[PDB]
TrEMBL record, chain A:
Quaternary structure and partners: Component of the small ribosomal subunit (SSU). Mature yeast ribosomes consist of a small (40S) and a large (60S) subunit. The 40S small subunit contains 1 molecule of ribosomal RNA (18S rRNA) and 33 different proteins (encoded by 57 genes). The large 60S subunit contains 3 rRNA molecules (25S, 5.8S and 5S rRNA) and 46 different proteins (encoded by 81 genes).
InterPro entries linked to this entry: KOW (IPR005824), Rib_uL2_dom2 (IPR014722), Ribosomal_eS4 (IPR000876), Ribosomal_eS4_C (IPR032277), Ribosomal_eS4_central_region (IPR013845), Ribosomal_eS4_central_sf (IPR038237), Ribosomal_eS4_KOW (IPR041982), Ribosomal_eS4_N (IPR013843)
GO CC list: cytosolic small ribosomal subunit
Record PROSITE patterns: RIBOSOMAL_S4E, S4
Lineage: Eukaryota, Fungi, Dikarya, Ascomycota, Saccharomycotina
Name of the protein described by the UniProt record: 40S ribosomal protein S4
Automatic annotation (TrEMBL), chain B:
Protein name: 40S ribosomal protein S8
Claim: Transcription regulation is one of the keywords in the record: no
NCBIfam families found in the cross-reference section: eS8
InterPro entries registered for this protein in UniProt: Ribosomal_eS8 (IPR001047), Ribosomal_eS8_CS (IPR018283), Ribosomal_protein_eS8_euk (IPR042563), Ribosomal_Se8/biogenesis_NSA2 (IPR022309)
Superkingdom of origin: Eukaryota
RNA sequence: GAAACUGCGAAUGGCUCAUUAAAUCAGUUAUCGUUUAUUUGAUAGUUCCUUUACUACAUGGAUAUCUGUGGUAAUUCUAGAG
RNA sequence: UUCAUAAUAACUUUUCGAAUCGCAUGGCCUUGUGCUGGCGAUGGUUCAUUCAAAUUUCUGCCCUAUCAACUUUCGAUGGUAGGAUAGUGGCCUACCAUGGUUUCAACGGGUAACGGGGAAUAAGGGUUCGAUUCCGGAGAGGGAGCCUGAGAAACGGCUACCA
């Protein structure tokens, strides 16, 4: 009905916002940005509901204004700016750097990171095409277009963007026996190896993934994000190395590592 | 206004559908331009998402392509002789797409002369040399040649003049041209 | 019949009422953007030529 | 820093369930069938038109508010001049 | 894929290619006030993308035969070409063909029918309800018609008619 929608009801929000059912009718709708609405994570949520540096929206706004938050080197001032997967959130005071990565369960984890890694962003390849004047460009599944790419970078390949300038420093080819991260579905937040790649030339390629504990699962190709060569990831993965325990196992862990 | 909705239609079964929702602006369709010949007059229309289509009510000139030779020239359109959809259009002189029209042809003739030097109906040294290098390539379909003699070439419009404002096409060649001629003859 | 006289050279304006239809009869069936002499309007206005431009109906 | 011009928004929200029975809608596809402000990336030495004296150290005319003259029983009515 | 893209032909009542703003006041002397240069705002081209958008595939709706034939002059089903549209398409127009749906209920009638998530009940199976907090969809007394705009056939916009 008539043009774009501008609000978001609290229940209609992505569940991995971890937003509480009460204390409001509305949720912070991610503005038009680099990442998809449902796959994003607004700055407000990151600030208030994760790190707890702000108490309310006004506080968040104030924080933003003094030009201190930095999403991928660039500044940002939107409360509802949609930082998503692999995005580096740097705070100038505190000197903390964060990379937005998922965890074993599904939601965005607070993952503290060093300045040596915070310099670069890792990004999947969505499209490879020749643009105007015959100039080749690559499209990252995370927002960007990069002109004149290395011509053996194809779709689904992951790319090390140096972020400070925005040039491709290095890349990983999508292939069997390469460390992978799942970014959508039930298996989202899981880390694996790629055992096999089914095709079905028509609709949705399925990739078979084994983790470190020899525990195979299948996801769609567009949910699968390459991260390195097995055992050696290009980024630091969060605590619990994207592993997925069974519920009982988790409970046991909780019990046996008690230290109140 | 004229709407392109499939709401007002009957279903596959022949069932008359009930009137759900009043007609929308995204369903809309505007009046026919039905362009005439003589003195250039082009009205812009604001479409969806900004953008302009150009209604070409009254057009005189047009640039037409000789696909064999590989050249196109701006030329006067003088009359619609045949239109596949409707004889009414022909009667009117309504310039549309796929209509068959008569072109001034003089520019084409001039071009030909410049190129080969052979002329249709009956200097420097470099030019002569060039001509020599060419030749025998200058033969053409007989029908075209005949037309040239009269001074008016048959061409088909391939632009949608109601959409672009631009009125453009291709000079009639080969089998298609022959077919068109036959059709014309039949009509007479 | 009231009149709204404006002199653009000086940039000065005045409102002058007429109590007689004979003095206003000069304006009857005249169009906006026409030249009307002051002589027949008033014995006071002599050598004057008005441009009638704009006005208001009753109500 | 009132006003006014310009920009942007007013198509979201809120309410209601009258219509509506392959319609809506649900899950599922598709756009190699299109439009898309905004967004975040991209991106344009070529506007010249002969090349011995040329606006570019920057071109033109308006119009709002305002100041004044009013119209109407009246309205978020607006004429005339500067 | 007649794709992306490039190339030759020309066309065009020739779109765009910054006569725009704030704070900085830095660097070489050819010692002019010269040539320069920093961080930003707004803009602007096409391509991205994002928020969207129109359509769109397959499958699924409650009673009723005291509705068995229905659709096709006034588009019904298909073809061809055009027009129109943001674009696909009988969406509309011209010419042509005679199809399309149906006892595995078409079509018609009713609904004290908005659809769904769901709710009440509660061995298993079910039955009834869902105007209503979320998601779709409609509508702003009724019907039309449009302006502005990226987006409305908008009604705390306009134009008309009826009440
Ligand atoms: Mg596909
Ligand atoms: Mg556009
Ligand atoms: Mg305004
Ligand atoms: Mg609404
Ligand atoms: Mg092409
Ligand atoms: Mg067609
Ligand atoms: Mg009802
Ligand atoms: Mg119901
Ligand atoms: Mg309901
Ligand atoms: Mg009711
Ligand atoms: Mg009422
Ligand atoms: Mg309305
Ligand atoms: Mg109201
Ligand atoms: Mg409203």
């Amino acid at each position: 009905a008539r043009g774009p929608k501008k609000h978001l009801k609290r229940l209609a929000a992505p569940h991995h916002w971890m937003l509480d059912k009460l204390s409001g009718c509305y949720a912070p709708r991610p503005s038009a940005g680099p990442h998809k609405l449902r796959e994003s994570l607004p700055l407000i949520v990151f600030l208030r509901n994760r790190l707890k540096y702000a108490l309310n929206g006004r506080e968040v706004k104030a924080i933003l204004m003094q030009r201190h938050v930095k999403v991928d080197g660039k500044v940002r001032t939107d409360t509802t700016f949609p930082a998503g997967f692999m995005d580096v959130i740097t705070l100038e005071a505190t000197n903390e750097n964060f990379r937005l990565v998922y965890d074993v369960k599904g939601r965005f984890a607070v993952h503290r990171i060093t300045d040596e890694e915070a310099s670069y962003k890792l990004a999947k390849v969505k499209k490879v095409q020749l643009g105007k004047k015959g100039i080749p460009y690559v499209v990252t599944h995370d927002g960007r277009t990069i002109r004149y790419p290395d011509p053996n970078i194809k779709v689904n390949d992951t790319v090390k963007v140096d972020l400070a300038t925005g040039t491709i420093t290095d890349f990983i080819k999508f292939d069997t026996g390469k460390l992978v991260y799942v970014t959508g579905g039930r298996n989202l937040g899981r880390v694996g190896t790629i055992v096999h790649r089914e095709r079905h030339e028509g609709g949705f390629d399925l990739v078979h993934i084994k983790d470190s504990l020899e525990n195979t699962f299948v996801t769609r190709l567009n949910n699968v994000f390459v991260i390195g060569e097995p055992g050696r990831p290009w980024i630091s993965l969060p605590k619990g190395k994207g592993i997925k325990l069974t519920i009982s196992e988790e409970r046991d862990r909780r019990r046996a590592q008690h230290g109140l | 206004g004229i709407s392109r909705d499939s709401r007002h239609k009957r279903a596959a079964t022949g069932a008359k559908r009930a009137q759900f929702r009043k007609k929308r602006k995204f369903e809309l369709g505007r009046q026919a331009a039905n362009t005439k010949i003589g003195t250039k007059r082009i009205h812009p229309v604001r479409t969806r998402g900004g953008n302009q289509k150009f209604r070409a009510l009254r057009i005189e000139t047009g640039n037409f392509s000789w696909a064999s030779e590989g050249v196109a020239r701006k030329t006067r359109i003088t009359g619609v002789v045949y239109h596949p959809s409707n004889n009414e259009l022909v009667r009117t002189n309504t310039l549309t797409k796929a209509a068959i029209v008569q072109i001034d042809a003089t520019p084409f003739r001039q071009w030909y002369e410049s190129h080969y030097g052979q002329s249709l109906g009956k200097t420097s040294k470099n030019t002569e040399r060039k001509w020599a290098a060419r030749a025998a390539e200058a033969k053409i379909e007989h029908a075209v040649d005949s037309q040239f003699g009269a001074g008016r070439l048959y061409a088909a419009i391939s632009s949608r003049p109601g959409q672009s404002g631009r009125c453009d096409g291709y000079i009639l060649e080969g089998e298609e041209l022959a077919f068109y001629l036959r059709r014309l003859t039949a009509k007479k | 019949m009231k009149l709204n006289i404006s002199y653009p050279i000086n940039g000065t304006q005045k409102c002058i009422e007429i109590d007689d239809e004979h003095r206003v009869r000069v304006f009857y069936d005249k169009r906006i953007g026409q030249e009307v002499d002051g002589e027949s309007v008033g014995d006071e206005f002599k050598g004057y030529v008005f441009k009638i431009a704009g006005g208001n109906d009753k109500q």
